[PDB]
């Protein structure tokens, strides 16, 4: 019944925040659809290196936002017990739906 | 095929033929061919005595059209010799009337280049 | 370039005659990267052959191209306060390239309004032995023999 959103700029801390809320959630009752990877949304920032004028030779970066999704089939008291309280987002972001 | 003043086309599809009138273009053309109901594909080469008169009737009676259309636009531009709107000059100085780069192009309104010129360096 | 002999890029055959020599010709017809328009012509012109000549277009085109290949030509060279056009042989690869190019250009100078017709007619003329593209062949070879004076600069 319950939909969860895991967004953030680092993938190694975002995949870890996912895999946790699965081992520590299956145990809690009805089972779960493991971390599923949404398309990354990228944002490019291009600009001329020099302060004055060399309108050719320049340099550019991005800002990538990777996502994942997880669906738990059924709301057991042992599940909403743990997850409703254990909020440990280091630089990760979350949203919840039903 | 003498419709307007001394204006006459031939051997071409009438939709196009009508074009060779001052104050008739693509649109005012096919607009007229429907209000007279005349197959555009037909050449001027072949069509009724009256088809032509009915055509002439519509066109000539309605809008205008060479001579006094031409003459209207001239007295328009004359009248912009009023107290002298910015657009009134530019028609006296024969320069563009609609906000444009004169320092370079503008050749369509100034007749061919007058190369009148000079600039130097220090010779020694 | 300066070290290796450069690469003789390999073609893939024709899908209607399985002839690599025919793709080569279609390439030279092609404008602005529009290979559909290109081969469409080539074939439409093969169709103009069949009507006005019960010959296999494949065989006409084959001869036409052969009849336009130039045996020899002139390549300028510097000797010392004098730039002579020295005459010499032609690579078989080079023979092909040119003959095809000349055919296509010969074609486009003709006065027939649609294309294929031109390419057809010009191919017919060439194989019969007398087109714009052959005058060109002839001309080039006349420049040799005339400058055979300096043929002893075969570089």
């Amino acid at each position: 019944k319950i939909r969860i959103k895991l967004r953030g700029f680092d993938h190694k801390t975002l995949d870890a925040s996912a895999q946790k809320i699965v081992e520590a959630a299956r145990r809690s009752g009805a089972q779960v659809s493991g971390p599923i990877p949404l398309p990354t949304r990228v944002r490019r920032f291009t600009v001329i290196r020099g302060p004055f004028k060399h309108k050719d030779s320049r340099e550019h970066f991005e800002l990538r936002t990777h996502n994942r999704l997880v669906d738990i089939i059924n709301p057991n008291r042992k599940t909403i017990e743990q997850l409703m309280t254990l909020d440990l987002p280091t630089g990760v972001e979350i949203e919840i739906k039903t | 095929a003498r419709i307007a003043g001394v204006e006459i086309p031939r051997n071409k599809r009438v939709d196009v033929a009508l074009t060779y009138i001052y104050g008739i273009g693509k649109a005012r053309a096919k607009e007229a061919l429907e209000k007279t109901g005349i197959n555009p594909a037909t050449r001027v080469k072949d069509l009724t005595e009256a088809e032509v008169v009915r055509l002439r009737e519509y066109v000539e009676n309605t809008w205008k059209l060479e001579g006094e259309l031409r003459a209207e636009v001239a007295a328009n531009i004359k009248r912009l010799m009023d107290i002298g709107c910015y657009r009134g000059l530019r028609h006296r100085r024969g320069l563009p009337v609609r906000g444009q780069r004169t320092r370079t192009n503008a050749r369509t309104r100034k007749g061919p280049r007058k190369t009148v010129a000079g600039k130097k360096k220090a010779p020694r | 370039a300066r070290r290796r002999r450069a690469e003789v890029r390999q073609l893939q055959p024709d899908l209607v005659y399985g002839d690599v020599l025919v793709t080569a010709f279609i390439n030279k017809i092609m404008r602005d990267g529009k290979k559909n328009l290109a081969a469409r012509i080539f074939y439409d012109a093969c169709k103009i052959i069949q009507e006005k000549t019960g010959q296999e277009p494949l065989k006409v085109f084959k001869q036409a191209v052969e009849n336009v290949k130039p045996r020899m030509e002139v390549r300028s060279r510097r000797v010392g306060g004098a730039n002579y056009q020295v005459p010499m042989e032609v690579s078989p690869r080079r023979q092909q390239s040119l003959a095809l190019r000349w055919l296509v250009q010969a074609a486009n100078q003709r006065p027939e309004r649609r294309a294929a017709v031109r390419i057809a007619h010009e191919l017919m003329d060439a194989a019969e032995g007398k087109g714009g593209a052959v005058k060109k062949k002839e001309d080039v070879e006349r420049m040799a023999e005339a400058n055979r004076a300096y043929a002893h600069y075969r570089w």
């Binding site: - | 009248r79 009023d82 107290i83 002298g84 709107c85 910015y86 657009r87 000059l89 | -």
Partner: protein
């Protein structure tokens, strides 16, 4: 063109309207070259600033749609 409205400045009309009250003479300075000439405003000569000085323009019926700056050149000799 502004198609709902006539965008003409108020500080101008005040001085035209109270001057319409018996139509007085008209030494009238302005900075509203961005404003229209309104129907009937004939006789009323308005001195228009063009960046540099106030050009005493006089008014006639034929000119009406046109703005004030459209009779007050900002530049000298082409």
């Amino acid at each position: 063109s502004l198609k709902k409205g006539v965008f003409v400045d108020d500080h101008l009309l005040e001085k035209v309207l109270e001057l319409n009250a018996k139509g007085e003479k008209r030494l009238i300075k302005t900075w509203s070259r961005r404003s229209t000439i309104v129907p009937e405003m004939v006789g009323h000569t308005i001195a228009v600033y063009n960046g540099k000085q106030h050009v005493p323009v006089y008014i006639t019926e034929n000119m009406v749609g046109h703005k004030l700056g459209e009779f007050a050149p900002t530049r000298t000799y082409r």
